[PDB]
Amino acid sequence: LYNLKERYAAWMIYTYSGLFCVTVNPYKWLPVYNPKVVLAYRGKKRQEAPPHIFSISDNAYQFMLTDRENQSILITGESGAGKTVNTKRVIQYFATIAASGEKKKEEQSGKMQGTLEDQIISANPLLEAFGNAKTVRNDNSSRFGKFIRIHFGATGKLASADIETYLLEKSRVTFQLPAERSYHIFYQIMSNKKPELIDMLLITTNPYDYHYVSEGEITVPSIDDQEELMATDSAIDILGFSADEKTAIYKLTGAVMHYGNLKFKQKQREEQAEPDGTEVADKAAYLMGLNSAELLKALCYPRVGVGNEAVTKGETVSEVHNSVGALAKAVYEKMFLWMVIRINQQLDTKQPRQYFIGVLDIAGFEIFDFNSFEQLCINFTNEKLQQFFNHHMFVLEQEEYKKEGIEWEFIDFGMDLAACIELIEKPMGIFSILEEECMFPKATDTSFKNKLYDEHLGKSNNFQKPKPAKGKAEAHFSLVHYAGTVDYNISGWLEKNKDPLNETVIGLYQKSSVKTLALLFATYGGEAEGGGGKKGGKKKGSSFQTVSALFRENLNKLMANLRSTHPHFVRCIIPNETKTPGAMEHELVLHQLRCNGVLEGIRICRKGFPSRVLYADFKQRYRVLNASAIPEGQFMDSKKASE
Amino acid sequence: DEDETTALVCDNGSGLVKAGFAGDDAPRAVFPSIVGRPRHQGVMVGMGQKDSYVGDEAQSKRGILTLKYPIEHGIITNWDDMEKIWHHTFYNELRVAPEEHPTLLTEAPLNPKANREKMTQIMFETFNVPAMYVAIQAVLSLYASGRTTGIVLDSGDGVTHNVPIYEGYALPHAIMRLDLAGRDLTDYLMKILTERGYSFVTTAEREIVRDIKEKLCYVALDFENEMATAASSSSLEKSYELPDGQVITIGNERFRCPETLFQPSFIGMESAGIHETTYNSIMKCDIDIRKDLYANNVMSGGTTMYPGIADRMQKEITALAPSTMKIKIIAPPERKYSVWIGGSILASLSTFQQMWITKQEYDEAGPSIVHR
Amino acid sequence: DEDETTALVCDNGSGLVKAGFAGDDAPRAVFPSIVGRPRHQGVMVGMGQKDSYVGDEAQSKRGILTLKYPIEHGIITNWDDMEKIWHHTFYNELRVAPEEHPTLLTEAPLNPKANREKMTQIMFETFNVPAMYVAIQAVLSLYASGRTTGIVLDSGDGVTHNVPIYEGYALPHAIMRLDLAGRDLTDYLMKILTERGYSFVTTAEREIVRDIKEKLCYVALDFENEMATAASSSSLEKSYELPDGQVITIGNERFRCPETLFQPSFIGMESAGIHETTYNSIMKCDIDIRKDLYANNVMSGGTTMYPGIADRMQKEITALAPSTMKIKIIAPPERKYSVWIGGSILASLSTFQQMWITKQEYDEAGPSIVHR
């Protein structure tokens, strides 16, 4: 704690802790990202230069060409740690130090749509408008995870990229805490820099007209919604999107606002929902390439298919408002997914690819007094990532003792975590019990709960019944993750995990005049064959059976990509909740350290032979001791030297 | 996805096989449960000598083959001929290779322990599937209607059953089987329609009596004053046009056929009927669970599709049940595939993965493993 | 407040546990005193494997578990299963952590010295409560009716007792125990009601005979010319509607059931009855204290709630007691919780603080300390 702290009060944000590259939020500006530095760190082992991210980032590259292996960089930290910033910054780094489109390099609309190095870059600012928002911690917080594959060529020059998105905060779209706000886009658009848009979408410039997006805050001083709107705009173009699509995006993003304005009322003497007007529906309908009526019907009189037919079901006021919200979110998401794909599509070149460098940006194990479903998914991700490291280290360590000739035997450090992982991902584990019950037409959260216990309680060690008191809000089940005990609340899971959507409506989308909208829904339309009658399995036709069924699939496809990689680690840190440069709350940093892996890397180090010096890092600092004979050694063989 | 896409669901019936991928909404494959064996030596033009025929090619070519039904009354009676229907299902109908697909199969209500072990022996040892699972049919039907306690009246082509289920466990001692179903029902219509002064003489006349039964048959409520209605001769009559012009009329018999399900006496059966049997199952169960079963009479099976079956059953058991009780007859529209859909749901489910019997379990525990 | 809020009162019975916070007017938690152990391996949907069930989940799921009663006739007979009911009480029912709450418990009339030491051993050593205290049940009932000398007829689910108390000290040699209570009484009604020509066949028929006993049963005064009245057949009859319509009628038996408490001969018991036993307790006590006991017959317990119990007892002992005596049968309305309420009062009291056995007393004196 103390080392970090001291070199921070001195304004040094980069300090290493083994393999890690700790990074602390300056909260102010620094000449570090300096265009001089970039070069400086170019072609240098981390022992030839001071702690910095470009060190990691260059070495990767090096290593990439030297060993002929693919690489990775894992950036991770809490909401306010400032990872995007790094991630982005790493990315620029790659683009710079190994570009050369030759023709694209000239000062003629440089970096505009029409080159990648730019596309690559331009990517961000689009995603950010849609997947970023003002959090109470950050002003531009990443509300989703991501993985880019920079596909380097044979020579060593840029060839392709690849994005993938994980866990998007769908809730912002409909909600927002009091000090927060929704995605930027909304506020961007209503900013009025492109007035047509306002009339085009049929909205106003006052957000308080759109409940969905003004539950929290509307304006942020550090952000210029007007400037961004263009940034965004321009990015779309560069990204190669069709105007139409670029039109769908917009039009589609406004429909969603409108939905939240959709109002209903109880039919008299009936408990049914009946439309409270065709003012808004009209707009939503038009904007989506729909028919007002058909739309309001489907919404109100959802026509289902229980048995072997299609049974028309009536809904309540409360049921509608909620379904609407479900589509709003559903639509936004999908779209977001699409955009990514489309991006990827442009980022696809024909040129050969020999290796890639993966840059992973996701959240780290965060513990809250309230841990719900989303927490499990993330924690699980991290507990995996951790084991991923612990192993790499075990492998790594063991090489030294082999190189040197020491006689040290030890078991994989990952192993310690396998217990927790199996409990989650294995067959009779949490997810399964979670995803099975989702098949029971009449199951309860409570039901699920019991199934969870009857099977794991008393029989499983990592499994425990909660500690209901302290800063926690209710009881259901705790798990014993590497970072500690997490108290999980199971309420909504079943639902959240089912992704219930009014299929009648989706129908309409599926046959929209707005192709794009139509597209986004296709994959739902193609699995319906499979879940034709009441009860059963959605997967028969390609429909998701679990909220969690993919997450896993994606998380596997990932951790696999992570393996055929030479892992490079970066841990981002957040000094003080109060936003003050040169300061640090203790216990706050302490926390991160445990959940980071930093404290676990120190542990494993200390088992034993604590301090472990990297050879160059060893030369430089100590050559001077027998100056003649130690310098010769270090220079003559980077390793043999220290020897 | 490995197996999210990959789980197969095969529902083996007395008349039809229903098959497809867990995930889908309805069976990808539906076909007769026959295996035809050619009575003479010879060939079709362009084909080779075929030793055997299955499903629709056995039905279509029935005049030169001896047709055989592997499943008598829901139970597999011939294992040589069943392995033939499975082979056809995987390789020709779904066109998948079985050795990379988990397979959820179904069995009947009081299916002998030894059979559940034998189809496991054949699934793992002759088809080499990665993993499999056998669900009980009424239990998948219930579950496909969302719930876990209820009583299923299940009725298909060779058997009818009542399977009371409580929090998922089908109750062995309360299950009733009535061997009169849609097969019996097509042959009775046949006679009341020849008896109306007709002739189903060629095989193109025989087959379509079954399509008359499906399209035009009804279960009237107050079957009493429906015969009475028949006589005053209302516009209750219904004429069907045959393969050719020969417009046949069916007024009345239209409902005399499903009245067989409430009155087995119409066909020289001395057994009790569907509604009484629903009830008797119920007064054979624990006392405290009888309000549950009564409010959850789930219907499944091709023969329970006759319109107005539910209303007749509704009133049939209200009037036998103590008035303090709530009666509730659930009959969904997709009911001819309830069983299958319940399997599709269950097998595509997030929590089912840990009940799949894997070749690891089998090679190590013997057929006993899946038998439970 | 530290413990003003914080004192717990747990009354352990043969049929029910009554629990809650000292201060409250009535028990926060009331539930059966059972511990169910599953007869088979399996799960409920969404739950894990459960080794054990307690209270109402054991009653509701009784068909798949072997039910066991830890307290036989008011005495704790199985200590593994009792620690299970306590655990359930603190952690699930009252949802408190026990290690910061003083706990007032109750025991039975001639509870073996060794038991009072054992539940103290388990309270302090496995639940780690700060302090605890064991009150005798009749003694809390008396005190909850304001007084300190009287005789309590206490009658619940497995035992009946008479505990003469003088200025707070229950009189060991005058206490009488009669093992016939509300449990015995529900099973006798059962037979006189099947004997009325009925059937409590399913478990939903069994359970409700007990709700008939509670709602419709009476203790008639002059039970003699009440049978005589039954015969002339007045509008004395009373029909109850079952879980369903099945309106059952109970005219007469309605009071033949509590006449069992005065005549044990109705059930093949040779012991004396409630009123004689009240009396015998009394002619076993000192002479000078007998006018006090007679004017203070306090009743407590679920089975003493039958209307007209007090009038019958009033006249039952007047006519056995010397005429120079004043008889007085106090039967309060909250009597099914007298015991508990007496504990709530006492433990929330200003002067009780100095009788709490603290872990300091225990870790220093051994279980002997609280045993007195």
B248 with B322, same domain? no
* DSSP secondary structure code for residue C251 in this structure: S
Nearest CA in chain B to A307: B334
Q: Count other Cβ atoms within 10 Å, centred on residue A281.
A: 23
Please report the residues numbered 352 through 411 in chain A whose beta carbons come closer than 8 angstroms to any beta carbon of chain B: none
**CB nearest to C46's CB, from A449, A458, A459:** A449
Handedness of CA A196, A201, A202, A207 (dihedral sign): negative
Closest by CA position to B156, among listed B279, B13, B33:
B13
The dihedrals phi and psi of A577, each to the nearest 5 degrees, come to -55, -30
Q: Which residues sit opposite B238 in a β-bridge?
A: B250
CB C159 within 8 A of CB C179: yes
**CB nearest to A432's CB, from B22, B144, B351:** B351
- Kindly give the interhelix angle for B113-122 and B79-88, rounded to the nearest 10 degrees: 50
A166 to chain C, minimum CA–CA distance in Å?
A: 27
For chain C, how far is it from start to end, CA to CA, in angstroms?
27
CB B144 within 8 A of CB B335: no
Query: What is the token pair recorded at B157?
Result: 């082509």
B117 with B190, same domain? no
Query: What is the token pair recorded at C197?
Result: 């020509």
> Cα separation of A547 and A549, whole Å?
6
**CB nearest to C44's CB, from A447, A456, A469:** A447
Q: Count other Cβ atoms within 10 Å, centred on residue C92.
A: 14
Instruction: Cite the annotated binding site of A for ATP by residue number.
Output: 77-84
Q: Provide the CATH number for the domain around residue C202.
A: 3.90.640.10
For this structure, is A270 an active site residue? no
Contacts of B24 in chain A (CB under 8 A): 527, 529-532, 537, 539-542
SS (HEC) of A339-397: HHHHHHHHCCCCCCCCEEEEEEEEECCCCCCCECHHHHHHHHHHHHHHHHHHHHHHHHH
CB contact C243 to B (< 8 Å): yes
> Cα separation of A285 and A255, whole Å?
8
For chain B, how far is it from start to end, CA to CA, in angstroms?
27
Which one from A180, A245, A366, A600 is the annotated catalytic residue? A366
Say yes or no for a CB contact (<8 Å) between B287 and C44.
Answer: no
Alpha-carbon C2 to chain mean position: 30
The dihedrals phi and psi of A361, each to the nearest 5 degrees, come to -125, 115
Nearest CA in chain B to C46: B351
Burial-class residue B67 by CB neighbours within 10 Å (0-12, 13-18, 19+): middle
CB C180 within 8 A of CB C155: no
Q: Say which amino acid occupies B37.
A: R
Alpha-carbon B139 to chain mean position: 13
DSSP per-residue string spanning C311-350: HHHHHHHHTTS-TTSPP-EE--TTGGGHHHHHHHHHHHST
Buried b (16+ CB within 10 A) or exposed e, A448-483: bbbbbbbbbbbebebbbebeeeeebeebbbbbbbbb
Instruction: Cite the annotated binding site of A by residue number.
Output: 77-84
> Cα separation of C49 and C47, whole Å?
7
> Cα separation of B145 and C298, whole Å?
57
Which one from A80, A325, A597, A633 is the annotated catalytic residue? A80
- Only one residue has tokens 């007469």, namely C252
Q: Count other Cβ atoms within 10 Å, centred on residue B2.
A: 10
B157 with B256, same domain? no
Query: What is the token pair recorded at C256?
Result: 């033949």
Q: What is the largest CA-CA distance in chain A?
A: 98
- Strand ranges, E, within chain C: 8-12, 16-21, 29-32, 35-38, 53-54, 65-68, 71-72, 75-76, 103-107, 131-136, 150-155, 160-166, 169-170, 176-178, 238-241, 247-250, 297-300, 329-330, 357-358
* DSSP secondary structure code for residue A307 in this structure: S
Q: Say which amino acid occupies A333.
A: E
Query: What is the token pair recorded at B295?
Result: 């409010």
C120 with C224, same domain? no
Say yes or no for a CB contact (<8 Å) between B343 and A309.
Answer: no
> Cα separation of A381 and A540, whole Å?
28
For this structure, is A390 an active site residue? no
H/E element, A204: none
Query: What is the token pair recorded at B170?
Result: 């089908």
Mutate to test the interface with C, among A445, A453, A472 (most CBs of C within 10 A): A453
B150 with B245, same domain? no
> Cα separation of B20 and B9, whole Å?
6
Q: Count other Cβ atoms within 10 Å, centred on residue B50.
A: 14
- Expt. technique: cryo-EM
Structural domain including C165 reads 136-181+271-332
Say yes or no for a CB contact (<8 Å) between A449 and C51.
Answer: no
Q: Where on the phi/psi map is residue C131: left (φ > 0), alpha (ψ -120 to 50), or beta?
A: beta
> Cα separation of C265 and C267, whole Å?
5
> Cα separation of B89 and B18, whole Å?
9
Q: Say which amino acid occupies A53.
A: I
CB C12 within 8 A of CB C76: yes
SS (HEC) of chain B: CCCCCCCEEEEECCCEEEEEECECECCCEEEECCEEEECCCCCCCCCCCCCCEECHHHHHCHHHEEEECCEECCEECCHHHHHHHHHHHHHHHCCCCHHHCCEEEEECCCCCHHHHHHHHHHHHHHHCCCEEEEEEHHHHHHHHCCCCCEEEEEECCCCEEEEEEECCEECHHHCEEECCCHHHHHHHHHHHHHCCCCCCCCHHHHHHHHHHHHHHCCCCCCCHHHHHHHHHCCCCCEEEECCCCCEEEECCHHHHCCHHHHCHHHHCCCCCCHHHHHHHHHCCCCCCCHHHHHCCEEEECHHHHCCCHHHHHHHHHHCCCCCCCCCCEECCCCHHHHHHHHHHHHHHCCCCHHHCEEHHHHHHHCCHHHHC
| Four-point Cα dihedral A484, A485, A486, A489, nearest 10 | 180
> Cα separation of A525 and A303, whole Å?
15
For this structure, is A141 an active site residue? yes
**CB nearest to C204's CB, from B168, B291, B323:** B291
Query: What is the token pair recorded at B301?
Result: 């099976």
Burial-class residue A166 by CB neighbours within 10 Å (0-12, 13-18, 19+): buried
Query: What is the token pair recorded at B153?
Result: 């009246």
H/E element, A3: helix A2-6
Q: Provide the CATH number for the domain around residue C153.
A: 3.30.420.40
Buried b (16+ CB within 10 A) or exposed e, A299-329: bbbbebbbbbeeeeeebebebbbebbbbbbb
Nearest CA in chain A to B148: A442
Handedness of CA C186, C192, C195, C198 (dihedral sign): negative
Contacts of B19 in chain A (CB under 8 A): none
Q: What angle do CA A137, A140, A142 make, to 5 degrees?
A: 90
CB contact B173 to C (< 8 Å): no
Q: Is C12 helix (H, G, I), strand (E, B) or coil?
A: strand
B177 with B218, same domain? no
Closest by CA position to A188, among listed A257, A121, A123, A240:
A257
Q: Say which amino acid occupies B204.
A: A
CB contact B325 to C (< 8 Å): yes
Query: In Å, what is the CA distance from B215 to each residue of B26, B98, B306, B313?
Result: 21, 36, 9, 21
The dihedrals phi and psi of B83, each to the nearest 5 degrees, come to -55, -30
Q: What angle do CA A212, A215, A221 make, to 5 degrees?
A: 110
Query: What is the token pair recorded at A637?
Result: 């063989």
Chains in contact with B via at least 3 Cβ–Cβ pairs below 8 Å: A, C
For this structure, is A55 an active site residue? no
Contacts of A454 in chain C (CB under 8 A): 43-44, 47-50
C101 to chain A, minimum CA–CA distance in Å?
A: 15
For this structure, is A138 an active site residue? yes
C82 with C162, same domain? no
A455 to chain C, minimum CA–CA distance in Å?
A: 3
B277 with B300, same domain? yes
> Cα separation of A142 and C212, whole Å?
65
> Cα separation of A596 and A592, whole Å?
5
> Cα separation of B14 and A125, whole Å?
62
C123 with C175, same domain? no
B143 to chain A, minimum CA–CA distance in Å?
A: 6
CB A528 within 8 A of CB A544: no
> Cα separation of B156 and B72, whole Å?
12
Say yes or no for a CB contact (<8 Å) between C45 and A451.
Answer: yes
H/E element, A14: strand A14-16
Query: What is the token pair recorded at B329?
Result: 């007859």
Closest by CA position to B121, among listed B371, B313, B367, B369:
B367
Strand A165-166 to B176-178 pairing: unpaired
Say yes or no for a CB contact (<8 Å) between B322 and C244.
Answer: yes
Contacts of B30 in chain A (CB under 8 A): none
CB B217 within 8 A of CB B260: no
Which one from A131, A358, A364, A597 is the annotated catalytic residue? A364
* DSSP secondary structure code for residue A303 in this structure: B
CB C299 within 8 A of CB C330: yes
Q: Is C358 helix (H, G, I), strand (E, B) or coil?
A: strand
CB contact A246 to C (< 8 Å): no
Say yes or no for a CB contact (<8 Å) between B285 and C206.
Answer: no
Q: What angle do CA A152, A156, A158 make, to 5 degrees?
A: 40
Q: Which residues sit opposite C340 in a β-bridge?
A: none
**CB nearest to A437's CB, from C45, C49, C50:** C45
C215 with C252, same domain? yes
Query: What is the token pair recorded at A530?
Result: 């499979």
Say yes or no for a CB contact (<8 Å) between C47 and A452.
Answer: yes
SS (HEC) of A440-504: CCCCCHHHHHHHHHHHHCCCCCCEECCCCCCCCCCCCEEEECCCCEEEECCCCHHHHCCCCCCHH
**CB nearest to B287's CB, from C44, C45, C201:** C201
Domain stop point among B267, B292, B315: B267
Contacts of C53 in chain B (CB under 8 A): none
Helices (H) and strands (E) in chain A, counts: 25, 15
Q: What angle do CA A608, A613, A618 make, to 5 degrees?
A: 150
Handedness of CA A35, A36, A37, A43 (dihedral sign): positive
A449 to chain C, minimum CA–CA distance in Å?
A: 5
Nearest CA in chain C to B147: C45
The CA R_g of chain A, rounded to the nearest whole Å, is: 27
Q: Where on the phi/psi map is residue C7: left (φ > 0), alpha (ψ -120 to 50), or beta?
A: beta
Q: Provide the CATH number for the domain around residue B61.
A: 2.30.36.70
Q: Say which amino acid occupies A301.
A: Y
Chains in contact with C via at least 3 Cβ–Cβ pairs below 8 Å: A, B
> Cα separation of B116 and B113, whole Å?
5
**CB nearest to B291's CB, from C207, C241, C243:** C243
Please report the residues numbered 172 through 211 in chain A whose beta carbons come closer than 8 angstroms to any beta carbon of chain C: none
Say yes or no for a CB contact (<8 Å) between A539 and B140.
Answer: no
CB A502 within 8 A of CB A327: yes
> Cα separation of B223 and B309, whole Å?
11
Say yes or no for a CB contact (<8 Å) between B285 and C207.
Answer: no
Which one from A141, A174, A191, A497 is the annotated catalytic residue? A141
Query: In Å, what is the CA distance from A193 to each residue of A226, A230, A233, B57, C80?
Result: 5, 8, 11, 69, 75
**Neighbouring residues of A273: CB distance < 8 A, sequence distance ≥ 6:** A264, A265, A266, A267, A300, A314, A315, A316, A317, A319, A320
Handedness of CA A316, A319, A324, A327 (dihedral sign): negative
Query: What is the token pair recorded at B128?
Result: 């080499």
> Cα separation of A100 and A89, whole Å?
19
Domain stop point among B235, B267, B299: B267
How many domains are contained in chain B? 4
Nearest CA in chain B to C241: B324
Q: Say which amino acid occupies C92.
A: N
> Cα separation of A512 and A508, whole Å?
6
For this structure, is A564 an active site residue? no
B40 to chain A, minimum CA–CA distance in Å?
A: 41
A99 to chain C, minimum CA–CA distance in Å?
A: 55
Long-range contacts of C177-181 (CB under 8 A, 24+ apart): C177/C73, C177/C109, C177/C110, C178/C264, C178/C271, C178/C272, C178/C273, C178/C274, C178/C277, C179/C73, C180/C260, C180/C261, C180/C264, C180/C267, C180/C269, C180/C271, C181/C14, C181/C155, C181/C156, C181/C157, C181/C301, C181/C303
CB B223 within 8 A of CB B255: yes
B41 with B55, same domain? yes
> Cα separation of C46 and A451, whole Å?
3
For this structure, is A366 an active site residue? yes
> Cα separation of A327 and A499, whole Å?
10
**Neighbouring residues of B111: CB distance < 8 A, sequence distance ≥ 6:** B74, B75, B136
Burial-class residue C40 by CB neighbours within 10 Å (0-12, 13-18, 19+): exposed
B15 with B95, same domain? yes
Handedness of CA B143, B144, B147, B150 (dihedral sign): negative
Query: What is the token pair recorded at A642?
Result: 């220290």
Contacts of B289 in chain C (CB under 8 A): 63, 202-204
Q: What angle do CA A58, A79, A169 make, to 5 degrees?
A: 110
Q: Count other Cβ atoms within 10 Å, centred on residue A589.
A: 20
Please report the residues numbered 22 through 51 in chain C whose beta carbons come closer than 8 angstroms to any beta carbon of chain B: 42, 44-45
Query: What is the token pair recorded at B160?
Result: 């009818």
CB A481 within 8 A of CB A365: yes
> Cα separation of B24 and B104, whole Å?
14
